[PDB]
Amino acid sequence: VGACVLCNSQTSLRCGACIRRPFLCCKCCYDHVISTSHKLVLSVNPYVCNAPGCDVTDVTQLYLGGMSYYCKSHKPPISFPLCANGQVFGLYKNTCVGSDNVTDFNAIATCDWTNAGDYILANTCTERLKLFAAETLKATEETFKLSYGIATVREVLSDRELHLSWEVGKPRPPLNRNYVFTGYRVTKNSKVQIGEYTFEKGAVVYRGTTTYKLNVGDYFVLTSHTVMPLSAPTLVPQEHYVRITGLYPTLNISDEFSSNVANYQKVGMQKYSTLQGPPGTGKSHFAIGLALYYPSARIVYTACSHAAVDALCEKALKYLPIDKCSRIIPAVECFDKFKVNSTLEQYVFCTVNALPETTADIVVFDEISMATNYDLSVVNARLRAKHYVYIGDPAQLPAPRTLLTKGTLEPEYFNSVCRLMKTIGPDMFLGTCRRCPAEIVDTVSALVYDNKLKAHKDKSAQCFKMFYKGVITHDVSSAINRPQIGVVREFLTRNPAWRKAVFISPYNSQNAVASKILGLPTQTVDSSQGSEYDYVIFTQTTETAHSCNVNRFNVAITRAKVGILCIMSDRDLYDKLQFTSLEIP
Ligand SMILES: Cc1ccccc1-n1cc(C(=O)O)nn1
Ligand SMILES: [Zn+2]
Ligand SMILES: [Zn+2]
Ligand SMILES: [Zn+2]
């Protein structure tokens, strides 16, 4: 028994064909089963023919005779159908409303989540459907990883490199940091974990979360966890205030955080606020300075990845009393300079999926473009706070949609918070970039920020761009452009100062080849987010939809502090690059 996902009308009915099995009142349970392929219906018992040897599960072909359900061939003389009069039989038949259109709820439950339009509807629908779509999408993603085969150690060629044997019949998952395997050893009766691993083409290379003398017979599987149901909404009801509520500003603040005093008060005059922070604008500076401005405020700093949650710890280590902090870790290594697992410690730093159930004066959700509507609902479910601050940049990169292949996901569809920022604008906007040269800022400002991003540094005069298509070769699940890597090599022979540069590309296979031919550190654009390097050498590799993505190309050129070389394939972003042009040797 539970609340309907369409009309809230109390129900004792659940759809058996939906992987989340939402409670559906007789009206909505009916309009769903007759308009889709979903026919299995669950209540206290399953609506299935209780006759020996019968396989009828469709509720339209089932009748309730006595207290057991049968079909047309197995029903008693005294029976009435379970599915008629626009209602499926179940408790609370008098309390049943119905919706003007269930069509939105149907496409959510039937879609394979491989199209961009599936994620659009999952973000525009009613709030209760945003929660249901988040579970359905995430439970689908946790199940698709079971479709991938098992990799087994056929040979241990050396350290750091392996020879893998893959399962038959099932496909193989791509080998990049977006897929994180988990190993096992063949014990007596069952198996035991031996850390998490990531792989890449060589035989394959690996990188282990822990070090081991792993041997033949060990196997790796993408660990899929549970998808618990969502109760709280993605966003609490917004409440604007006339005074600062529940918070108390300081009389003495330092000149380091003085330019934020207006926004720190803005945080106290809203139930929740949004802060867009382009690269180099000082987002973690903002989040920690907010603590000094409201000194006695219990603040919970949170994000999805431990890396983002640890970057806040580094700044809290630089400004806040250490005995007032705590790092929450569930029983991969992370920041271990605060007392671990102390929920009653003023400043709490934790990931979303590990969040305890507690209250706080302020909550700081960092790097919000990575979040999903599932994460947003968990934060509101575990954390009941007075003010919610959402820090991020919807012009940066979103969470990887491992099923999405057709179409492109726009920033307003990343999550509910990014929808507000890209439509009604963000409550706050850090508009000065103190990291990149002027040519980079003057490029991403017009590209994704409506010319509202101001450069603090001057022109570095060391930003260059070349238009070289070259030769594109493909492999299993990545692309490789060696003539672009070769152009970089010929550039490096005439610019040996650019050998302290980081090589960045949209494809990790391009990084692997570039690591062998150039010897520069490698980062995919998605792995480079949140990090700054002096020099960056970027090869777009292709002009597919993946490499031309403006939120990716924004991150691709903003990691530079001094200079950058961009070997471009797409003419569009090549002309949008305000860089000194170079010719092809
Ligand atoms: C990077 C940045 C951009 C803008 C404003 C402040 C900062 N920042 C200063 C500090 C520090 O003093 O540690 N951290 N971050
Ligand atoms: Zn269904
Ligand atoms: Zn309903
Ligand atoms: Zn039957």
Author numbering: 2 to 203, 208 to 336, 340 to 593
What does the paper say about this structure?
To identify possible starting points for the development of NSP13 inhibitors we have performed an X-ray crystallographic fragment screen. 648 crystals were soaked individually with a library of chemical fragments at a ~50 mM final concentration. X-ray analysis of the majority of crystals showed no bound compounds; however, 65 bound fragments were found within 52 datasets using the PANDDA algorithm. Whilst these fragments do represent useful starting points for inhibitor development they have not yet been validated as inhibitors in biochemical assays or as binders in alternate biophysical assays and are not expected to be potent inhibitors without further optimization (see, for example,34–36).
The SARS-CoV-2 Non-structural protein 13 (NSP13) has been identified as a target for anti-virals due to its high sequence conservation and essential role in viral replication. NSP13 is a 67 kDa protein that belongs to the helicase superfamily 1B, it utilizes the energy of nucleotide triphosphate hydrolysis to catalyze the unwinding of double-stranded DNA or RNA in a 5′ to 3′ direction. A long 30 amino acid linker that does not adopt any secondary structure links the 1B to the 1A and 2A RecA-like core helicase domains. The nucleotide binding site is situated in a cleft between the 1A and 2A domains with specific contacts to the nucleotide provided by conserved helicase motifs I, II, and III in the 1A domain and IV, V, and VI in the 2A domain.
